[PDB]
């Protein structure tokens, strides 16, 4: 029992938003929509210390002779765990999958941006809307990958003006809809990593291709 998956539906849905937004300059980090890390950044964690500059009843002292592992090693170096795979291949493969979409179809996103208007007042209801019909189907894996390029360039459409004030309320809709409704059907249809092995492609950059034309069928047959 070590499952969790954080990073996995969260950490997704920024990177969509960000590997979109490059294609145009701006940066996701631009933003944040955070508050510099740390609770508001106080100045008054790290770079400043509380000390004077000797106060006495404290020569850096602290014992400075523990057993190697253990109070020095330990707790800032032992422990394995490398934070196991977080996405990676689920990453990529979100970004192939997107030039997969961009090619036909025409409509679909279409019609969720103009069933939504992204803007300056807008929130999760109407977005939970729209989306419900996508997921409406069974949460296909098709419907997924359609999902990331959907709330992904909506989100574009407000940070391609300087306008995040909306594109960070973007990835929040999408992380509780793909962690609280898409997630429990990728694992009930296979995982993330079946998933990655459907479109997440590596780069073979062949597809049983890629080699002059060798003989459609021999041209005297």
Request: net charge negative; charged share 20%.
């Amino acid at each position: 029992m070590s499952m969790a998956m954080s990073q996995s539906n969260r950490e997704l849905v920024v990177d969509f938003l960000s590997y979109k937004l490059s294609q145009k300059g701006y940066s996701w980090s631009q933003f944040s929509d955070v508050e510099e890390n740390r609770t508001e950044a106080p100045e008054g964690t790290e770079s400043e210390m509380e000390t004077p500059s000797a106060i006495n009843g404290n020569p850096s002292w602290h014992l400075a002779d523990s057993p190697a592992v253990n109070g020095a090693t330990g707790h800032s170096s032992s422990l394995d765990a490398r934070e196991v795979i977080p996405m990676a291949a689920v990453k990529q493969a979100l970004r192939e999958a997107g030039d997969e979409f961009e090619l036909r179809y025409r409509r679909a996103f279409s019609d969720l941006t103009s069933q939504l208007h992204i803007t300056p007042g807008t929130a999760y209801q109407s977005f939970e809307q729209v989306v419900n019909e996508l997921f409406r189907d069974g949460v296909n894996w098709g419907r997924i990958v359609a999902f990331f390029s959907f709330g992904g360039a909506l989100c574009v459409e407000s940070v391609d003006k300087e306008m995040q004030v909306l594109v960070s309320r973007i990835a929040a809709w999408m992380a509780t809809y793909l962690n609280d409704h898409l997630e429990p059907w990728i694992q009930e249809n296979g995982g993330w990593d079946t998933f990655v092995e459907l479109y997440g492609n590596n780069a073979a950059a062949e597809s049983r291709k890629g080699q002059e034309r060798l003989e459609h069928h021999h041209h005297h047959h």
